[PDB]
């Protein structure tokens, strides 16, 4: 099996019901100083977006708003691939990046065995090279990339950056200033589809594999197939960035009007803030109470207790709700109200390890449920 990478982390991941406190402690490329409260030394708002001002007052430079001369992507077999997993190498990559006019970025994430989710890999492409950054190994040093990610002079290209922005801050306190989302461009041009696959075919006649879109990216070592899959998400992003700007340029008859909307739309995505998830048992009964609420006092109580048991276990063990106890099972167990512990198991096909490990604790809960008084209209009906 794969050993949880969280165990080798320097700082225990916090997924309590406390609001999210940005991890950034140093603010490169700043215009508005970082609140003293966030300084590494002490460890004017605080839960506010660290680059709120910089982004609000951000606009792309005229250099990028002019007629684009699309630079073809470098042949894949002629492009060097670098694996970065040490501060030294990360620090050197940031230097190269600080001399680029633009570069591409993408993140591989994992959520099945993690409560909040975990960024596992970060891919970056320049006009000449592809980089694969191991963000499990470099989790605590990733903040350094802020120097180039929040450098308004450099354009960061993403394809559909909504999640990446939230992951970048939630995991490494990283933020982005001056971004161009090709996904946003594709929408603004009203293209057939808006996915990266379409853009890769439409612009580079490249076929995209997807065997790994849902793979387990915590795996180490990462097999060549997965590295190839990972570099393909950024290897062609810069060219597409150019070709899409040419299109907006040719549709604007020669005006940077459609270009600026993309930069504007994209900067709004960079202003999105991460917010810890908050689930309630009320919601997990919408599709249920709206079809057949057979749930009596005893059953509803069992569901409440189980819902709570799952939330606490998931947070404590840093696992996703699905790993701990998927809904359909939690709901079935609440329906059957199994008298014996083995009866709870009979409802799990298969049986999730944490449900077997905590079977007695769960049993005592269902037992409480079975002791609840039934209303008159429930004993008879
Ligand atoms: Mg992506
Ligand atoms: Y409730």
Swiss-Prot record:
Compartments, as annotated in UniProt: Cytoplasm; Nucleus; Nucleus, Nucleolus; Nucleus, Nucleoplasm
Domain HRDC as annotated: residue spans: 296-376
Glycyl lysine isopeptide (Lys-Gly) (interchain with G-Cter in SUMO2) cross-link, chain position(s): 376
Residues annotated as binding Mg(2+) 2: 106, 108, 233
Domain of life: Eukaryota
Phenotype upon changing residue 109 to A: Slightly reduces exoribonuclease activity
Cross-linked sites for Glycyl lysine isopeptide (Lys-Gly) (interchain with G-Cter in SUMO1): 376
Residues noted as binding Mg(2+) 1 in the record, renumbered to the chain: 106, 164
Domain 3'-5' exonuclease, chain residue ranges per copy: 82-248
PTM summary: Sumoylated by USP36; sumoylation does not significantly affect EXOSC10 nucleolar localization and association with core exosome and USP36, but regulates the nucleolar RNA exosome activity in rRNA processing by promoting binding of EXOSC10 to pre-rRNAs. Effects of sumoylation on EXOSC10 levels vary between different studies. Sumoylation of EXOSC10 is required for the modulation of EXOSC10 effects on cellular protein translation and cell proliferation. Sumoylation is promoted by mild hypothermia.
Residues flagged as site, Not ubiquitinated: 376
Family: Belongs to the exosome component 10/RRP6 family.
Name of protein: Exosome complex component 10
Organism: Homo sapiens (Human)
Lineage of origin: Eukaryota, Metazoa, Chordata, Craniata, Vertebrata
